[PDB]
């Protein structure tokens, strides 16, 4: 994929964790919006963030997006074992389909 993500991120329980999403400026993030998903293997994904700032319904306050032209970020506050899953970023526009990134794994320590 034109989008890339770090292979993995980690932190201790209760620690904040940040996940980057980057690519060519034409894909991320000039004139583009990035959405974020949880996607456990063997299971359907859940939408977490859309328009880089808005939480999807049913999503805990601990999840929040941040943005820069070079990269979109997802930050998870209060890291829990419940969040120990694979995440994907998706670049999108109102006139185009989703472009998925390579994804990242999140590990929870202690």
């Amino acid at each position: 994929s034109v989008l890339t993500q770090s292979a993995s991120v980690s932190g201790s329980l209760g620690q904040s964790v940040t996940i980057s999403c980057t690519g060519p400026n034409s894909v991320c993030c000039s004139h583009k919006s990035i959405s974020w998903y949880q996607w456990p293997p063997g299971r359907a994904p859940t939408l977490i963030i859309y328009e880089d700032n808005e939480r999807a319904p049913g999503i805990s306050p601990r999840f929040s997006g941040y943005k820069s032209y070079w990269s979109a970020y997802l930050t998870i506050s209060d890291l829990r074992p419940e969040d120990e899953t694979t995440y994907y970023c998706c670049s999108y526009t109102h006139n185009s389909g989703c472009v998925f990134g390579t994804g990242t794994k999140v590990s929870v320590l202690g």
Partner: protein, 130 residues
């Protein structure tokens, strides 16, 4: 709001397959129906989407020559909910086309995020063997 997909099926190479996506608990015509593929060697891939309302569809360039999308006419249950189904057909299956296929529906009726796959079906496996 729930989406239900056709169960897993085994195919020979070059075979066509048809996958249903039954819907309930929300108005079928109000949201875009998205299709997403996941394969271990490729990761998630967008297969495009079809509007249940206008019939308009947007296939990703990779799938424009192989994927056909259609929908059923919705049947109302309440003034604000209905049932119906979307279907997708894949022509000329390859071993590279194996893995889980998902049905999903659009997030909003309007705004720039309207087509995002907010709700997902459980997904089902497609297998190709000689």
């Amino acid at each position: 709001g729930q989406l239900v997909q056709s169960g897993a099926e085994l195919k020979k190479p070059g075979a066509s397959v048809k996958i249903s996506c039954k819907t309930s608990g929300y108005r079928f015509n109000f949201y875009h129906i998205n299709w997403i593929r996941q394969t271990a060697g490729r990761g998630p891939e967008w297969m495009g989407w079809i509007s249940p309302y206008s019939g308009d569809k947007n296939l990703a360039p990779a799938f424009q020559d192989r994927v056909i999308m259609t929908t059923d006419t919705e049947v109302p249950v309440t003034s604000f909910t209905s049932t119906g189904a979307a279907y997708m057909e894949i022509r000329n299956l390859k071993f590279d086309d194996t893995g889980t296929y998902f049905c999903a529906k659009g997030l909003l009726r309007d705004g720039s995020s309207t087509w995002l796959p907010y709700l997902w079906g459980q997904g089902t496996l497609l297998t190709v063997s000689s």
